[PDB]
Structures are given as C-alpha cells and as structure tokens.
C-alpha cells in the first residue's frame, strides 16, 4: 500500500549539545526539506494462512540518511539492515533490536533471511515469534561484534488513538552512526499534524563501509495488516510505515529562553525564506532587499588542438649511456610533437619525481611551447644541491639552477651504470673559478688556476692547480659516492603558438551556447560567436585592456572567433510587510527575460526556489 502525502514541517533536531538561549544561530547540515513527498511504503506479507508469494520487501536506498516515523504497537518492526549485497563480497552489518537490548555486529554472511516462515505464523492464531533470525548462517571472516542497550524505549501509550509517534533520523557521516530520535504520543490519530518538536541524540559508533541500501526488519514469523495491492501515482493506502530522505540544506533556528527549539526556516524554499535567511529575523519590513546572484552554467565542453602527430623522443634522452660530465653537460630541444608523460612516473618508480611547479598528475592536459633536457651524473649526496637558491661545491662552479625554475628533476641510482675497479677518470667537475656561475651556461675552459701572486705561464706548479678534478668513482663504496644519473626537464609557459601538447581528443566546435572551451590551454567558459576582426597572419590572440582574452583563432581551422561572458546579474526581492501578506515579486538585475530567466532548467539557475511557472 504505497502512498504519497505531504510532510509539512517535521524533522528539526539539535545539531550539537551546547546550551543556547535567545539565539538565532543558523546552520548548514542534513535536514528534511519542508513540504516534501512522504511516501508510505508497505512490506506486504499477510493473507489467510497460505504462503502468498509476494515479491515484496523492496530494496530502499539509504540516500543521505533517512527519516523514519512510525506508530507501531509493540514490536512488529524490530530492526534494520545496512550494507551492500550482504554476501561474501562486501562487508555487511546486523542491527536487531531486542525487547531491551541491541545486537549490532559486523559480518560477511552470504544469506541470512531464512527464518522458516511458518504456515501457522499468523498473529491471529499465535503471535509467538522469538529468535526468528537465522542470521550469519555463513561466516568466513567475521570478527567485529558488538552489544549495547536498546535505542528505542519500548513504552506503551495505553491506547491506539494516542499511539507512540516514534521518530528516528539515520545518518552515517564519517562513521559514527547517528540515531537522533524522539518519541511523542500527543497526536490524536491523524497523520503528520502541524507543529514543532526537536529530536535528541542517543549514541554514535564508527564502523565504516559504503552503506547503500536500507530495509527494516519485520517479524517474519508474525505479520498482519499488510494487504496486497499495487497503489502508486499519488494515492492513499494504510501502511503503518513511513520513510523520508534528507538533503544538505541551510536552516535558521531559534532557541527558547528555556533552551528548547521553537521555530526554524529553510532558506531555499521561498524568496520570502531567502530574505528571512539573509537578515537574521523572522519579521521583515516592507521594502526591497538583495538575496543572491544567479548565473547560467555551462552545458558541455570542447577541446580543439593542432593536428600534430609524432612521439617526442623522451625514450632517447632518458635511456642512454654516454652522458658527459657535470661541467660539460648536453642540451636538447623538443620539436613539434605530442608527449606522453605516463611512462615517466606511472612506471619504474626509482627515486622521487621531485616536481617544483607542476604536479605529475596534473600533466597531459596543459600544453607547452618547448622542453629542454639536460643530463649529468653527480654525487649521491649532491642531489640536494639541485634546487633554487641552494649553494654548494657544484651549485656555484658546476651547475646553477635559477630561482624560479619550473618543471621537474629526475634522478635514479647508477651503481651498475658506472662502477670501475680502477675508478672512472672520464668524469670531471670545475673546482676553482673567478666568480659564481650565472644560471644556464657553460664555464668550460682549458686554463690553470692562478691563486696568490704567481703569474703561471703554464707552469702549473705552486699556487697553480688544475680546476678540473678527476672524479674517480668507486665500484664497492656505499651511497653518496655511488652514481646517480640525473636528468632535468625545464619547461616554460610563454604566450606563443603552442608546440608540444598532451594526448587529448579534439571534439567538434559548438557555438552560440554557454560551453566550456580549451584552446591549447586557455581554460574558460563563454559563448563562442563569429568575429569581424582583422587578425594578421602571425597574430594568435585578441585582447581587451584587462589582460583578458576576448578573441581566439581556431587552431586546426584557422578561423577567428569572439568570446563573450555568460549572462550575469543580481537578484532582488520586493515584498510588502510580512504581517500584511506573504506574496513577493522577484527582480532580476540587468538581464533580459528572453535570455534565460523566462524559464528555469535543471541545475541552470543558482536560486533553488522555482515556485513560479516563469
């Protein structure tokens, strides 16, 4: 007997435990939206005495917690199921409520819903249903168990008219199962009256899984009041069983001087509610106010890159054996190609990536104008010298790295790559020099150092020592003097026609629509239209005086376009006295109705309220 009715005002609860008085504190949390569909689900298993195959007990998703209200006599509804598929592939829970006990536990049972539903199990003949669980019939690795006191206080309201209105709110944000609840029998029989009542907390404990679906435990050996039907499409049918789905909303909440919640408003229902939320009060005087600011959102995305094809020789530069010395390195330039950065870090994790400006994961999307590659082998200890502003024996006379270096430096061990019993005398480094090296140039020079006041003419005697020192590697010594093959990738982001991009698909060119565009790395959103500009053959980008791009030539079509921002403006609410009327009149600042406010579409208008037919 599924049915659909209105929820009205229901679901307010204390979000914390601190005491407050005469405060208008506002919060942003999971709540039950005002005036929402509340649907009576109905697990239907009772008819005479026979089996009555029913295919009922539908899987109810546990979406952002659930609001559960009930008027249950004693124990017909007992417990609940949370988990995924309840088998030996995903962890499962067990939450069963005794008379006064709780037996929550964790297990991976494949099947547990076999309580041997009897033919004579109808309560009209006998209501005896004890230990009708037959749960965790299988347990491969089930260890996490738990016991505690009952959550619901099983109290009888001594009559059916003033039945015990039982309310729970279930949420599992970062573990710590919340069971905020409240009992109230004041209702005289009707469903969901008008009023206010906050809900107190009970307990919270952490377990941790992707809990996905929900279903209450019924007394499978004692059932009644569930007739068979297929009611739907906003109808009415007795079920004695409720459900409600929460959403993350912002609420304004008032506290009585005793400390009890008295009233609350949801900021995202009515322009009047928005006005009441913006200024902290429940009465708004006649006038005009500002509430929010709407803006149209993009509908899709497009990427257009040149038609370049060719794999950059990153394999050639990385894999080699005849790298030269530190003082005399080698420089290489990357030509027009597309570069696959996946093999750099996703494979062969030898040493740290040591990124400085760009992150390795954020690669393969941005595009570059040129790439430099340098290779040398150094001290294992001198690795830290390769960093901006860092000084050392080689950081001043062998290799200087600029302050604002961008890109990454790649190094890996070379114990096998370079080890001679007699030592390696083919590796050199400059030791003495007149001045500190400016970044990125060579100081190679065949000359004898002149120290003191001895003008050596090639004597190379006292106070005249060779600046280049034969490094002399070792095959058996420990780390540090062990060889480290070092390569450095130097990028630059210069506003020029891009040369080397990542691997991306070039989609079609849409126009006259609010879309997201990426023209060789110019991220942004707007409406691409025709342009009448007179771009010269070497011109690439247009510009207004803001350092803001407003004209882009198509890369693979050689056609210029115009870029315009999305429709944008503020929102105003015109209302009379709040004690005179409740109607309003929304003003959309500086926009034409024909552009977009003539109708609201799904997720295309920041103001949530759309109570107008527009």
């Amino acid at each position: 007997t599924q049915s659909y009715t209105n929820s009205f005002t229901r679901g307010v609860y204390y979000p914390d435990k601190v005491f407050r008085s005469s405060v208008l504190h506002s919060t942003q949390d999971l709540f039950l939206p005002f005036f929402s569909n509340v649907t009576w689900f109905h697990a239907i298993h009772v008819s005479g005495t026979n089996g009555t195959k029913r295919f009922d007990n539908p899987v109810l998703p546990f979406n952002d917690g659930v609001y559960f209200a009930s008027t249950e006599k004693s124990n017909i509804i007992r417990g609940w199921i949370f988990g995924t598929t309840l088998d030996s592939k995903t962890q499962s829970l067990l939450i069963v409520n005794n008379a006064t006990n709780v037996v929550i536990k964790v297990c991976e049972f494949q099947f547990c819903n076999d309580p041997f539903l009897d033919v004579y199990y109808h309560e009209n003949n006998k209501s005896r249903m004890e230990s009708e669980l037959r749960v965790y019939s299988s347990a491969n690795n089930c260890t996490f168990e738990y016991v505690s006191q009952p959550f619901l206080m099983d109290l009888e309201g001594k009559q059916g008219n003033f039945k015990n209105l039982r309310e729970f709110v279930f949420k599992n944000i970062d573990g710590y199962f919340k069971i905020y609840s409240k009992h109230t029998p004041v209702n005289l029989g009707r469903d969901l009256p008008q009023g206010f009542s906050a809900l107190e907390p009970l307990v919270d404990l952490p377990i941790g899984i992707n809990i996905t679906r929900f279903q209450t435990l019924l007394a499978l050996h004692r059932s009644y009041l569930t007739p068979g039907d297929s009611s739907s499409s906003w109808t009415a049918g007795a079920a004695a069983y409720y459900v409600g789905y929460l959403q993350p909303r912002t609420f304004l909440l008032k506290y009585n001087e005793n400390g009890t919640i008295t009233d609350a408003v949801d900021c995202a229902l009515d322009p009047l509610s928005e006005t009441k939320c913006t200024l902290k009060s429940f009465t708004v005087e006649k006038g005009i106010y500002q509430t929010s600011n709407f803006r149209v959102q993009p509908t899709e995305s497009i990427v257009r890159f040149p038609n370049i094809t060719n794999l950059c020789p990153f394999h050639e530069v990385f894999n080699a054996t005849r790298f030269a010395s530190v003082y005399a390195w080698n420089r290489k330039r990357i030509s027009n190609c597309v570069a696959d950065y996946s093999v750099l870090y996703n494979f062969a994790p030898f040493f740290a990536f040591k990124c400085y400006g760009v992150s390795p994961t954020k690669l393969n999307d941005l595009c570059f104008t040129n790439v430099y590659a340098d290779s040398f082998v150094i001290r294992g200890n001198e690795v830290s010298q390769i960093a901006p502003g860092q000084t050392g024996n080689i950081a001043d006379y062998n290799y200087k790295l600029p302050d604002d270096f961008t890109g990454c430096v790649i190094a890996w061990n070379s114990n096998k790559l370079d080890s001679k019993v007699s030592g390696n005398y083919n590796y050199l480094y400059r030791l003495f020099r007149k001045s500190k090296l400016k970044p990125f140039e060579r100081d190679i020079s065949t000359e004898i150092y002149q120290a003191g006041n001895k003008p050596c003419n090639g004597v190379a005697g006292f106070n005249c020592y060779f600046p280049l020192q034969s490094y002399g590697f070792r095959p058996t010594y420990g780390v540090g003097h062990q060889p480290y093959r070092v390569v450095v990738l130097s990028f630059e982001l210069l506003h020029a026609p891009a040369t080397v991009c990542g691997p991306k698909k070039s989609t079609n060119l849409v126009k006259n629509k609010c879309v997201n565009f990426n023209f060789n790395g110019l991220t942004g959103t707007g409406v691409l239209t025709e342009s009448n500009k007179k771009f010269l053959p070497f011109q690439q980008f247009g510009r207004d005086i803001a350092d803001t791009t407003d004209a882009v030539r198509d890369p693979q079509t050689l056609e210029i376009l115009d870029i315009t921002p999305c429709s944008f403006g503020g929102v105003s609410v015109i209302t009379p006295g709040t004690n005179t009327s409740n109607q309003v009149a929304v003003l959309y600042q500086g926009v034409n109705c024909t552009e977009v406010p003539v109708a609201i579409h799904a997720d295309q208008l920041t103001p949530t309220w759309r109570v107008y037919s527009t």
């Epitope: 020789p313 050639e316 894999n319 054996t321 005849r322 114990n415 096998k416 001679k420």
Partner: antibody, heavy 123, light 108 residues
Framework: QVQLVQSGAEVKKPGASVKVSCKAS????????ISWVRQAPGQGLEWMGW????????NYAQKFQGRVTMTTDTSTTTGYMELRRLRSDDTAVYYC????????????????????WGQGTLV | EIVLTQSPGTLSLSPGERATLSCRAS???????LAWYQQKPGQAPRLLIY???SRATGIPDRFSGSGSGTDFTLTISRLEPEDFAVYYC????????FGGGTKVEIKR
C-alpha cells in the same frame, strides 16, 4: 604486453636475397629499436644488427660492412630483413628482439641486453 | 673486438646443489655491460639478468648475480630441473659478442 611474431621458413638460391618479415604489435614501435641476431646449433649469437624506427641510422658491426641493410615500416609495423649476397651455409635461425642496447636518434648505446625475443625464422 | 671466454664446461650437478657460472672477458668489460639468457632446447632466448642482480622474467629464488669489474659470477640455489637451459652471457661496452655458453644437463 609485447607481441613479436615471425614468418615461416624460407629457402633461397645463392646470388639472390632473403626477405623475412618480423611483425611487432602491442608496444609503440618508436621507444626502442629492433635487433636482428643469428643463432646456429653448437654456438652462441653475434651482433648481426640493430634497426631504428624513423630513419636509416644503425649500429652495424664491423664484420658485414657493405651488405647489412634492413628496413622498417611503421605503417606496416614490420621489420624487413633483405639480406643480399647469400652465402652457401647461411642456414641459421634468425631472432628479432625488442632491443634494449642501442639508441635511435643520436646513436648512444643503451643499458642491458635483449629482454624479449622473436619466435625465430629458420633458413 | 673482444670475444668472451668461458670455462664452465659442464654443469654436472643434480637438482638441489649450488650452481656457479663465470663470464670472464678477455682484458676488460666495464660493469655497465651485462646480459644473461636461458637457451632452452628448441625454444627462443629470454633475458634473465641484465645487470648485477636484477630480475627480468620473474626469477623467484634461483637466478642471482654479483661481481665487480674484472670478475662476474652467477649463482643458482635449489635448482628445479624443468628448464636445464643454456647459460649465456653477454657484454655490451666493448662492441657486442655473445659468450661461449654452457649447456645444463640432468645427470640422471
């Protein structure tokens, strides 16, 4: 996920040339070169040759200068061996391997050996 | 050029005994030149050791290597006789020439 396959056995008379196709798939045929090597019973292998991807640069040994000229087709993704001036008893198995010892553009040698080999063509 | 010289003439050992292999060169081979292969009968070569002690195709517990400069040695412990492949060694720094080789028999 290397895929290297070779054609069947071939017999050619002296004075002609032997053309054998080595098909490569599953890996990009530009990161590493392909080395062709020869094996005969009772003895090890040699430095028959190594072939690059984009151009004709090679690392031919000092034994067979003037004859060793193979080709590669990146469109066909096939290494073609076209050994000319056949010798009387050149009958031996040929292995095309994804080499890890020679570099393509600037000619600098690599590190290691021959990781993945071919299935072998017997002539 | 330089041709390798091998004198592990016969590995006449039963499974379970230690096996040692040597690949002494002529005059010098630098440590950045090493390759080792198993030549199974009627099969294709495959790389096992491309350096000092690294792994190419699995190598759970058997293929080990060490050495420095003029000496290089390969060690096998607890050998399982399914392979009985030829131990081939190769240097790279001085041109390229495969080693003599060493057949591995069963010793029934």
């Amino acid at each position: 996920q290397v895929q290297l396959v070779q054609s069947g056995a071939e017999v050619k008379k002296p004075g002609a040339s032997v053309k054998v196709s080595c098909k490569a798939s599953g890996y990009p045929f530009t990161s590493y070169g392909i080395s062709w090597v020869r094996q005969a019973p009772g003895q090890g292998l040699e430095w028959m040759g190594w072939i690059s991807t984009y151009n004709g640069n090679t690392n031919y040994a000092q034994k067979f200068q003037g004859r060793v000229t193979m080709t590669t087709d990146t469109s066909t993704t096939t290494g073609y061996m076209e050994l000319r001036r056949l010798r009387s008893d050149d009958t031996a198995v040929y292995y095309c391997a994804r080499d890890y010892t020679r570099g393509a553009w600037f000619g600098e040698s690599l590190i290691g050996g021959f990781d993945n080999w071919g299935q072998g063509t017997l002539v | 050029e330089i041709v390798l010289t091998q004198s592990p003439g016969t590995l006449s050992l039963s499974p379970g005994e230690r096996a040692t292999l040597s690949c002494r060169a002529s005059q010098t081979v630098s440590s950045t030149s090493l390759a080792w292969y198993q030549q199974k009968p009627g099969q294709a070569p495959r790389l096992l050791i491309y350096g000092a002690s690294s792994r190419a195709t699995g190598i759970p517990d058997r293929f080990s290597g060490s050495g420095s400069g003029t000496d290089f040695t390969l060690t096998i412990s607890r050998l399982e006789p399914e392979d009985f492949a030829v131990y081939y060694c190769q240097q790279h720094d001085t041109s390229l020439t495969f080693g003599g080789g060493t057949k591995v028999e069963i010793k029934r």
